[PDB]
Amino acid sequence: CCNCSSKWCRDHSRCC
16 A cells, blocks of 8 residues: 555544
């Protein structure tokens, strides 16, 4: 999935 180091990842993905 994306990286939790970027707000986009936390917003464009629920893997965080």
